[PDB]
Design a protein around this ligand. Structure first.
Ligand SMILES: *[C@@](O)(C(=O)NCc1nccs1)[C@@H](Cc1ccccc1)NC(=O)c1ccccc1
Ligand SMILES: *[C@@](O)(C(=O)NCc1nccs1)[C@@H](Cc1ccccc1)NC(=O)c1ccccc1
Lengths: 299, 299
């Protein structure tokens, strides 16, 4: 019993993290087979509007210093793909897990291994927000840290941390180097849009709470998809789709509570609040558990 | 920026987790040097009131099956220490980290690596509650999972999971096999006492929030230690000591807010609530960050 915000075991990623230095910029890199992936602004000193192409021109393989713990790696190639650099090294990482690079959708969750100078500091669970930011915990030197999911022995890398916005939220790329959302790797006038709540996730957490003993919010009412979406638009919740209803099926089946009945419970929680009660230890509705996360944790 | 509930990187522990089977009971074990540590109720089928001594009598080394991934380990010795078994195996774990066994105090936090059948499933941060339980997330088969802290390369094991109480909270031992609190490894009429809030931790989280931009709760008032403790007793918060004031010094120094001024802010939050605002993304006061956790994360 219990429901907690849980990350995947981080070991398979820890073995991949290295330190990359270029001139005087040190950040974190990700070493998989014979390539080290890092943010491209490792070649920068500038940040107002860098011509990354022209900055990479003054650089050769020997200008990139890659250190894996204490093992110094020999760089034999370098290229820019979008906003990442790929440093070919002469040795395969013996520690490379089975892995895939994946571009996730807003609403999906992942674990983050925060790193500084190539060394892991902590692990936590995050979500890609609807506005394509993540609410992380990152400090200077954290760029190059990565987000991932682990299915069986396979690591699905989905995020590389690049930057912190003036709002205190975080922006970054997939492992192909394309940013999530509209952000650019410059210090410019960029700011997060409207962050909306992830309705399908809230419902799944409501299901997690029933499985674990919290049921005061269960009402004697039901609703319709269109009726609920009117309420969600008012409260800046994302619209709920029949695809979302279908994904919640297994949770509906386990608990015997129909998705539309849970929607009417959420409806009442949105118009009435919690009246000083808590659900799974929180006085706010939680939207960073996917339906898959509830099933995995509760089974 | 950002403040999140963060666990230590779990890799050093993942390499220590094994599967222990005795008869038909399988649970998790912890393999360090040439000893595997597991809960002693691996030798049980009973649970009402087991005579553990007499159950261990019918067992020999070959009755304990230890599997580390797919490597089968050969047991050459066994003993009972308090509520754990120590299985001597013929090979040292090549993956053994530098480690220490530590009995932590209520109020202290640690990371938990939840395991099933010797395989890690997730990592999360927990605290030893004042009533010597932990509010974990554990399912059948999770016994033998461990809690730990990591300072530099040294793993400080502090918890082994044994049991879930009828209340849905969790109880377990240090790695010497002594339970935290009064619990016994039996299915009997045992229940958690009064859980109180960890005042020194709440204050440290209040400091974390100021560091990160949340300051609406900062008041134009101060208070005294005795005055505050009257308020804390009413709201079932632990008494605050001069030792606690001293531990918060570095956070006081960074932010320039005196501990007793923060106490007056907490005072007002306790008598008035949050009036529908949030602090660091929560509408409840958080007590599972130690002062050390705030500094480590915010630096
Ligand atoms: C990285 O870009 C980085 O850490 N990005 C993510 C952040 N999260 C919170 C704050 S920053 C590094 C690259 C770098 C630059 C210069 C020296 C060493 C590393 N950027 C910074 O660390 C940085 C951030 C803000 C102002 C100056 C420097
Ligand atoms: C462990 O004692 C165990 O998992 N303890 C911690 C728990 N947290 C939440 C639920 S239980 C195992 C040992 C065992 C016994 C029998 C077969 C395999 C393993 N106990 C249970 O898994 C168990 C719990 C509750 C009822 C029956 C069995």
């Amino acid at each position: 019993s219990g429901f907690r915000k849980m990350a995947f075991p981080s070991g398979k990623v820890e073995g991949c993290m290295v330190q990359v230095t270029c001139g005087t910029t040190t950040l974190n890199g990700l070493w998989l087979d014979d390539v080290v992936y890092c943010p491209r602004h490792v070649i920068c000193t500038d940040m107002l509007n860098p011509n990354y192409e022209d900055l990479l021109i003054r650089k050769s393989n020997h200008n990139f210093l890659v250190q894996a713990g204490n093992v110094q790696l020999r760089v034999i190639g370098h290229s820019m793909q979008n906003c990442v650099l790929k440093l070919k090294v002469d040795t395969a990482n013996p520690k490379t897990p089975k892995y895939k690079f994946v571009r996730i959708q807003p609403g999906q969750t992942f674990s983050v291994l925060a790193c500084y100078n190539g060394s892991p500091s902590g692990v936590y669970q995050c979500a890609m927000r609807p506005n394509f930011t993540i609410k992380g915990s990152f400090l200077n030197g954290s760029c190059g840290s990565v987000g991932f999911n682990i299915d069986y022995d396979c690591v699905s890398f989905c995020y590389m941390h690049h930057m912190e916005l003036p709002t205190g939220v975080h922006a970054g790329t997939d492992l192909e180097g394309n940013f999530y959302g509209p952000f650019v790797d410059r210090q410019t006038a960029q700011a997060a849009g409207t962050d909306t709540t992830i309705t399908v996730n809230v419902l799944a957490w409501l299901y997690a709470a029933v499985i674990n003993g919290d049921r005061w919010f269960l009402n004697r009412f039901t609703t319709t998809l269109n009726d609920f979406n009117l309420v969600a638009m008012k409260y800046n919740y994302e619209p709920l789709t029949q695809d979302h209803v279908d994904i919640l099926g297994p949770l509906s089946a386990q608990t015997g509570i129909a998705v539309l009945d849970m929607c009417a419970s959420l409806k009442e929680l949105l118009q009435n609040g919690m009246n000083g009660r808590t659900i799974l230890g929180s006085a706010l509705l939680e939207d960073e558990f996917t339906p898959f996360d509830v099933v995995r944790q509760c089974s």
